Amino acid sequence: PKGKLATTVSVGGVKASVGGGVRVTSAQAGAGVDVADTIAYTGLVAGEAYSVSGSLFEVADGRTVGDAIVTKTEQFTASDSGAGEWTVEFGRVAGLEPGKQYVVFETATSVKDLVDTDGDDVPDAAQVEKHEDPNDASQTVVVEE
Ligand SMILES: [Ca+2]
């Protein structure tokens, strides 16, 4: 099993655009904003449960800065095809700062062992797929100054 995650962050129901992120006003940041993330997954094991942890990180100069602003973990089930979409809802996120940018990272970890890593034909490790791209605009929230 070898899969891929793609992510698209959403704020106030606005999806980050492929080349544009999603913008929030300084006042909205101060009030708190509802953040969600849609994970497009492929090559997961059909019908299997995955523990998905998402983090929102401050990003500057192409790196995450400090500990995540928020983290959320929940369980999802993979579609019958092993490909599909899951939506993580972070709730209202506070403390995003004017003029700063934030990025969503996601990691999916199968509840069951599904990967043979030593070659004895027995599954010994979870399938783990992750999307942790600090420069991915589709995962990026930008707060106006
Ligand atoms: Ca093995």
Side-chain angles (χ1 to χ4, degrees), residues 1-3 5-144:
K2 205 65 185 73
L5 302 184
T7 70
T8 308
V9 71
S10 216
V11 183
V14 176
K15 273 314 191 184
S17 51
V18 58
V22 52
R23 297 194 309 105
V24 303
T25 72
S26 167
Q28 286 160 358
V33 292
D34 293 344
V35 181
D37 197 76
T38 304
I39 301 164
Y41 63 85
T42 58
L44 302 194
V45 181
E48 282 298 324
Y50 288 77
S51 180
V52 173
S53 181
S55 295
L56 184 69
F57 282 100
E58 180 180 343
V59 165
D61 297 312
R63 298 179 196 81
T64 67
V65 178
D67 290 347
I69 307 305
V70 292
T71 296
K72 176 149 182 206
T73 307
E74 57 191 288
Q75 184 185 97
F76 296 97
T77 301
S79 78
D80 291 346
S81 66
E85 288 188 351
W86 297 321
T87 299
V88 174
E89 298 281 348
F90 286 99
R92 203 169 189 78
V93 174
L96 301 190
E97 299 180 71
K100 296 204 172 189
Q101 111 178 10
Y102 301 84
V103 70
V104 176
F105 288 4
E106 296 283 357
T107 298
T109 305
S110 67
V111 169
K112 295 185 191 167
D113 281 346
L114 298 175
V115 172
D116 181 15
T117 66
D118 57 21
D120 67 354
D121 292 321
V122 183
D124 60 79
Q127 188 182 10
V128 178
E129 307 297 345
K130 81 190 38 181
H131 189 65
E132 301 191 320
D133 184 357
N135 306 302
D136 185 352
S138 280
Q139 298 278 49
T140 301
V141 181
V142 175
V143 186
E144 295 180 3

